Amino acid sequence: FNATRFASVYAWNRKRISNCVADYSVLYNSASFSTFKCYGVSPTKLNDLCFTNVYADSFVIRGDEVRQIAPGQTGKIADYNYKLPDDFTGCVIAWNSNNLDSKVGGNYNYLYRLFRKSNLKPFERDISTEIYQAGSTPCNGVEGFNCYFPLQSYGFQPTNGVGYQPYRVVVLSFELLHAPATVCGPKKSTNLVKNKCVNFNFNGLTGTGVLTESNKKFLPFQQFGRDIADTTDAVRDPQTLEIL
């Protein structure tokens, strides 16, 4: 979040987070206005659940395209620099960063691509900076007749209006499937009860029932069993690795 340098849109840095505790309480320590419009999940105290893997991506977006980063959206950079799938589930965090990126000397380190001749698939990385050719005549390293450079700098200056001010953003993406979870919220464990009608919570698998010993020949890679009706019939304890 508070890195010294953030990479450009055309080359965003992707970061992998696993095997730890994700406390989501630190989001309210940064700048006051930090947009938290979430897809698929509700951040209003309902982020305390287990996920499988987490990918973090960061770049700097101008206000003319702040809302381009959204599923099923098109625009200048949505289809050319960063594409989000329609079925994307996750959260996008955005906040103003005029006090950092904008400088009196001049910030020209940020670029965005315009000439590609092809769209972007969800989560595509385009790093080539070759001169685009829009005509039959090869560019051969010179501009002019249907030969324009795809990479255009941003020219962030503080003088410019709030609309053109640079905002630092970050986007969080998760997945919640049958694979064992690696990142979990701050929940406290509790002892195991057997042969009693109690509630239970196994990494978000909330339910009600009676837990007993199971004779299932679970294989080491197998997490939980299922029955004919396609319902969770047996489970494995995350701590003692016991099949119930």
Partner: protein, 240 residues
């Protein structure tokens, strides 16, 4: 040594038929006494596969990595060691390497100066330079039929394997054997071509014939059957 040697004469590879091999557990969910229908990448039934013979005609050419590869080798004394992958197969770009030793396996993913015929005798005669290895992980050795299924979806490299002890000199036998998952390797880059390597006691010099088959996976729908136990005992290829 891994310098330019042309001792092996190139010949068209033979072809053999894979009857009911190449079935793997597609999920961690445990089922018993049901028939479940799933859609996933699979080796089509009765699909013929390339046959390669190594030795002094060692057949170690480069082969494309086309959406998952089935691998098998009926050879004694585990002559084969490991596999390598990548796009340009040199230090210019990132590549993935998997090898094996007497008592473990070494998996790294970093730029290597691969020579023309990397092979393992030899100890580290497969490359000469290393840029920066983002992942590394050592576990127990995989160690006469040995089968392997390679899958690289969403950047998670997955390996399914099974060691079936048989003693014969024929082709792939008729029979069923579901492949169980072994590891999951998050690498995040793509692979187009791949190549194998073997333990050769290069210079007299110890040598022996080695064989290995290669088959490609396709998106199909299968109907796997689970018995009252945990095992998969039969399957049906829908579009055969």
């Amino acid at each position: 040594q891994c310098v330019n040697l042309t001792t092996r004469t190139q010949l068209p590879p033979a072809y053999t038929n894979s009857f009911t091999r190449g079935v793997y557990y597609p999920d961690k969910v445990f089922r018993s006494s049901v028939l479940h229908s799933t859609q996933d990448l699979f080796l089509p039934f009765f699909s013929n596969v390339t046959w390669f013979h190594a030795i002094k005609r060692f057949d170690n050419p480069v082969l494309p990595f086309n959406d998952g590869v089935y691998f098998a080798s009926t050879e004694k004394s585990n002559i084969i060691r490991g596999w390598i992958f990548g796009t340009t197969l040199d230090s210019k770009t990132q590549s993935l390497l998997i090898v094996n030793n007497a008592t473990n396996v070494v998996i790294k993913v970093c730029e290597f100066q691969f020579c023309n015929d990397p092979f393992l005798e030899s100890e580290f005669r497969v490359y000469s330079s290393a840029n920066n290895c983002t992942f590394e992980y050592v576990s127990q050795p995989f160690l006469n039929l040995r089968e392997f299924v390679f899958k690289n979806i969403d950047g998670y490299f997955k390996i399914y394997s099974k060691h079936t002890p048989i003693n014969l000199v024929r082709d792939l036998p008729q029979g069923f054997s579901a492949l169980e998952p072994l590891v999951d390797l998050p690498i995040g880059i793509n692979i187009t071509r791949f190549q194998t390597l073997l333990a050769l006691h290069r210079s007299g010099w110890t040598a022996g014939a080695a064989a290995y088959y290669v088959g490609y996976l396709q998106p199909r729908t299968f109907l796997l059957k689970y018995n009252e136990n945990g095992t998969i005992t039969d399957a049906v290829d829908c579009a055969l």
